[PDB]
Ligand binder design. Structure first.
Ligand code: CDL
Ligand code: FMN
Ligand code: SF4
Ligand code: ZN
Lengths: 118, 244, 182
């Protein structure tokens, strides 16, 4: 990809590094800046640098959508993101999610989704 | 006004007031319709004079207690909104307002519910808890939340999935409702658990020992060592009362 | 010995010598008691802090009357909101305590008479020096000064009565210019 600069010139960046994450091309929030906007506004500090080695972590919006829906027998699903393999709490506060409505419903701390067995 | 309170009134005006005062003690005048129910031999509705003894009402106007007098566990003399009475009190108690208040109970709707020794009194009181949960209007905070809490705790005390100090906790829960309400349904929901805890505490402790022996130890709230939230549910222990 | 030393080497958790080298060290030492301060590796900081077994059984500690679930209202142990007020005494309030008395030793009339007697002090009716001149012997000697007529000393919350340790139980011997106070 070639990005047009504010002074009229071109900024050639490979496609691998214009992705917002390695597992997502686009942004996941309005106020989030695209990588093209980042380079277009900060290329003076990216110029002789290696984009191979910069931080490019995976996006959770796409990893939590891979996690399958959990199913419960009732109107309530209780979520506590506990480890179950080490001592202490190590999770988020205990939350009770209503699931009577038709679709799936996510926790507010983690994005684990629950349904009413249908 | 109650149906009875107006239905009698023409007879009190015709027959002359002092007649109606000829019955009962000084401040507990008149006749009263008594519905006797439960574990009595011939369940009945009768009309007797006030301040009648309870043993007389049960033996003379009903069949007595099913299995003999000393097979009696307790009597609820004023409906669900009144604390239970133990056998020691019912032998020489009079069915009036004043005396039944003198034994920390009340004459309510004059509905006598008799309980045998073969029965589970904790099931009776937890069913009254479920009743007051279903019948709460849902307006003010303590009845709203506390009827549910009382039922959740009594469902566990039925099976013994609790501790011995949680009885005192439950008493404090009833006191969180017993005067902080708009209407008297909260008091009516607090009083029977108080009566149970006052007269039938070792039965509760025995049920909890039975659970500790037959199932396993327990923590505050009915939790066990293995109880965990696994996949949207509590899996490692019993959950009393959940039917949805 | 005394309760605080000396102590042998083999009771000190430090790595020492073995064999002929210990027999030499105890020959060539100013104090064979003394240790080479290398911790014993099998015993010191082993098991490591991140591999302790006590973490799996550790639970949050408590004390009984505060952890109780039944007879433990917070307002009976809310000591922050039961904080002591700061008392302030201007000269008006102390001539009231002097001209009149106190709730422990009242010297005030009854009814509205004492009320406006107080009110005469709340406003500048009688002054502090006037009240001191007008004050009897038994007022001053007992409510300003002590019963014996002496002034009160700068009070001490926890009085500490010192004792000097001398001789063998002291830190330094007799010659040295530092002493030991219990
Ligand atoms: C030219 C360059 C060549 C450099 C190499 C020299 C190496 C050598 O000669 O090894 C000799 C070798 C040194 O001993 P080492 O093998 O290193 O000690 C091993 C023990 O673990 C040592 O046990 P330790 O750790 O408990 O040490 C005890 C120590 C205790 O030392 C003392 O307390 C004595 C304090 C000094 C006394 C000075 C008096 C002079 O004694 C000594 O180490 C020997 C002191 C002499 O053997 C001799 O002692 C021969 C002495 C001549
Ligand atoms: C939850 C609740 C339920 C009541 N239900 C009745 C009832 O079912 N029938 C009745 O006549 N009185 C009932 N009462 C009593 C009063 O609502 C009202 O009837 C009043 O006490 C009547 O006055 P009276 O006894 O002089 O006739 C109830 C009170 C409460 C708090
Ligand atoms: S106490 Fe009475 S008013 Fe309050 S929620 Fe219960 S039924 Fe409604
Ligand atoms: Zn969650």
């Amino acid at each position: 990809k070639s990005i047009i600069s504010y002074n009229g010139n071109t900024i050639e960046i490979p496609e691998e590094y214009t992705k917002q994450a390695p597992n997502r091309d686009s942004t996941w929030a309005p106020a989030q800046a695209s990588k093209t906007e980042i380079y277009k506004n900060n290329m003076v500090r990216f110029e002789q640098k290696d984009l191979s080695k910069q931080p490019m972590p995976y996006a959770g919006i796409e990893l939590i959508a891979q996690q399958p829906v959990r199913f419960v027998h009732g109107n309530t699903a209780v979520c506590d993101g506990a480890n179950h393999n080490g001592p202490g709490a190590q999770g988020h506060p205990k939350i009770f999610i209503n699931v009577d409505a038709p679709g799936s419903h996510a926790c507010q701390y983690c994005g684990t989704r629950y349904e009413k067995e249908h | 006004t109650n149906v009875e309170t107006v239905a009698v009134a023409p007879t009190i005006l015709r027959r002359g007031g002092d007649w109606f005062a000829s019955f009962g003690r000084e401040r507990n005048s008149g006749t009263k319709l008594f519905c006797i129910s439960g574990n009595v031999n011939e369940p009945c509705t009768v009309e007797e004079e006030m301040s009648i003894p309870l043993r007389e009402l049960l033996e003379k106007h009903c069949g007595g207690i099913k299995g003999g007098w000393d097979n009696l566990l307790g009597v609820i003399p004023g409906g669900c909104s009144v604390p239970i009475l133990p056998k020691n009190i019912c032998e020489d108690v009079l069915m009036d307002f004043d005396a039944l208040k003198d034994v920390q109970s009340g004459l309510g709707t004059a509905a006598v519910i008799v309980i045998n020794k073969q029965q589970d009194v904790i099931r009776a009181i937890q069913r009254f808890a479920a009743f007051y949960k279903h019948e709460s209007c849902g307006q003010c905070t303590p009845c709203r939340e506390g009827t549910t809490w009382l039922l959740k705790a009594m469902d566990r005390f039925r099976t013994g999935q609790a501790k011995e100090r949680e009885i005192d906790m439950l008493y404090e829960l009833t006191k969180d409702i017993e005067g902080h309400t708009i209407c008297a349904l909260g008091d009516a929901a607090a009083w029977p658990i108080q009566g149970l805890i006052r007269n039938f505490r070792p039965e509760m402790e025995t049920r909890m020992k039975k659970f500790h022996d037959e199932v396993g130890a327990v923590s505050v709230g009915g939790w066990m060592k293995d109880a965990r939230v696994e996949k949207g549910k509590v899996v490692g222990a019993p959950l009393p009362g959940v039917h949805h | 010995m005394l309760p605080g030393g000396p102590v042998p080497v083999f009771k000190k958790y430090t790595v020492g010598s073995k064999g002929i080298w210990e027999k030499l060290r105890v020959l060539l030492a100013i104090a064979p008691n003394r240790s080479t301060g290398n911790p014993i590796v099998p015993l010191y900081r082993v098991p490591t802090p991140g591999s302790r077994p006590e973490a799996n059984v550790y639970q949050d500690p408590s004390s009984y009357p505060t952890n109780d679930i039944a007879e433990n209202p917070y307002w009976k142990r809310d000591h922050r909101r039961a904080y002591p007020q700061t008392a302030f005494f201007d000269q008006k309030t102390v001539t009231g305590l002097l001209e009149l008395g106190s709730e422990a030793t009242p010297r005030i009339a009854d009814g509205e008479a004492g009320t406006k007697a107080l009110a005469n002090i709340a406003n500048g009716g009688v002054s502090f020096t006037q009240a001191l001149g007008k004050s009897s012997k038994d007022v001053i000697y007992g409510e300003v000064l002590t019963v014996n007529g002496l002034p009160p000393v700068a009070p001490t919350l926890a009085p500490k009565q010192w004792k000097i340790i001398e001789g063998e139980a002291a830190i330094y011997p007799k010659g040295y210019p530092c002493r030991t106070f219990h």
